[PDB]
Amino acid sequence: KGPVCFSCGKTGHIKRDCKEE
Ligand SMILES: [Zn+2]
């Protein structure tokens, strides 16, 4: 279990981490 991406819905990064820039 790791950071969930609330943008794509994947794992290994958070939404905020996803396309932060
Ligand atoms: Zn993502």
Rounded distance, CA 20 to CA 6, Å?
12
What letter represents residue 16's amino acid? R
Rounded distance, CA 17 to CA 20, Å?
5
Cα(1) to centroid(ligand 1), Å: 15
Cα(7) to centroid(ligand 1), Å: 5
The widest CA-to-CA distance across the chain, in whole angstroms, is 25
Method: NMR
Cα(16) to centroid(ligand 1), Å: 9
If DSSP codes are grouped into helix, strand and coil, which group holds residue 1? coil
Cα(10) to centroid(ligand 1), Å: 6
Q: Are 12 and 3 in contact (CB under 8 A)?
A: yes
